[PDB]
């Protein structure tokens, strides 16, 4: 068991192992930036915020640090530490998760500048790379965008969810009952294009002029799309509209490479049964010169139903203690 030293940081006292040097508050919690002296990086350790206080917030508790430890992938966040000051269940109030110190956003490193065409196929790539890995734990994103990926400035980039519609699927803007992973695929066409063009390619106003938007692109829905939509109002009201017929790619994203314009006509299909899967994506020939099939890992999936249970706040408390004793550093 490590030294632990208290400091009042975010309105609080922290105390935290005397390996984590210099807290420094940057920002379901409270983080600083701090200096591992173990591994000699620059890390960022979130008090997660009143983690036991409600039964709400002991299941986020509970699925953020059990999909947290599950996450063992280059492209994808991960956990460097997960520690409690706390000696027995009985007086566990706390929980600080350690990551890598995250400075910078896709954001912070393109500044709305349209990027070189090696520049988007690299970071693309990574972004598919961790999407395929990701999906192979049965997990959806659901809010992928820039500000949702931590970037280097090398480019090297992890996705995560610290927790704008511009990037969003159309059917998770409207609500629709059940979703496949290709939705964070949709994401990641937005993402490319704007990587591609300098400009953001659905900048709705707001949820009716955001899908006006994408309609104008992709097209009203088809023949083979409408027979799918469950609700008679959603049928009826889509019948309504004036067809429009998708957009040639060809010509929206002119001058760029026409395997970049082939892969987002794959991303940005209305139909979400007709999009590119990450994997199917990632052997798509825009990336030859960054593909490996046998460095593109895939997860063992675990039991996401055990987090989507109704238990009591103490249940969740020593089920959240547990995972918190069982933590195994990575390599
Ligand atoms: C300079 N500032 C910082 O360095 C900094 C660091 C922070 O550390 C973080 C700590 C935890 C998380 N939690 C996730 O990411 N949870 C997550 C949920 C669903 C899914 Cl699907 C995923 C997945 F799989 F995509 F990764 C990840 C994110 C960031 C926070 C704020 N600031
Ligand atoms: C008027 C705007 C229409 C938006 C239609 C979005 C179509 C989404 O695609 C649909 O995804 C569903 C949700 O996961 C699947 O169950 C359907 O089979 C698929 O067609």
Redesign the pocket.
């Known amino acids: 068991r490590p030294t632990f030293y208290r400091q009042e940081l975010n309105k609080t006292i922290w105390e935290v192992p005397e390996r984590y040097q210099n807290l420094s508050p ?2 379901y ?1 409270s ?1 600083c ?1 701090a200096f591992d002296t173990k591994t000699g990086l620059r890390v ?1 350790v ?1 008090k997660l915020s009143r983690p036991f206080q409600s039964i709400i917030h002991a299941k986020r508790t509970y699925r ?1 640090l059990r ?2 430890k599950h ?1 063992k992938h280059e492209n ?2 991960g956990l460097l530490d997960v520690f409690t000051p706390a000696r027995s269940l009985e007086e566990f109030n706390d929980v600080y ?1 350690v ?5 910078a956003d896709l954001n912070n490193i393109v500044k709305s500048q349209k990027l070189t065409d090696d520049h988007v196929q690299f970071l693309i790539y990574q972004i598919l790379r ?1 999407l395929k890995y ?1 999906h192979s734990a049965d ?1 959806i ?1 659901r809010d992928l965008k820039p500000s ?1 990926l931590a970037v280097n400035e090398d480019s090297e980039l992890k ?5 704008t519609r511009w990037y969003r699927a159309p059917e998770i803007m409207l609500n629709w009952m059940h979703y496949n992973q290709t939705v964070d695929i949709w994401s990641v066409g937005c993402i490319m294009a704007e990587l591609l063009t300098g400009r953001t390619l659905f900048p709705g106003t707001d949820h009716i002029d955001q899908l006006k938007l994408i309609l104008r692109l992709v097209g009203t829905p088809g023949a083979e799309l409408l027979k799918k939509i469950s609700s008679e109002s959603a049928r009826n009201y889509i019948q309504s509209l004036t067809q429009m017929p998708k957009m040639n790619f060809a010509n929206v994203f002119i001058g760029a490479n026409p395997l970049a314009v082939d892969l987002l006509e794959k991303m940005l299909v209305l139909d979400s049964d007709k999009r590119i899967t990450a994997a199917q994506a990632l052997a798509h020939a825009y990336f030859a010169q960054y593909h490996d099939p046998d460095d593109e890992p895939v997860a063992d999936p675990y039991d996401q139903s055990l987090e989507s249970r109704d238990l009591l706040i103490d249940e969740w408390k020593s089920l959240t203690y547990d995972e918190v004793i069982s933590f195994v550093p990575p390599p």
Do not use: Q, R, S, W
């Open positions: 940057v920002g919690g983080v930036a960022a979130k953020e999909l947290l996450m994808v966040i998760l990551t890598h110190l995250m400075g961790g990701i997990i994103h949702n996705i995560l969810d610290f927790g």
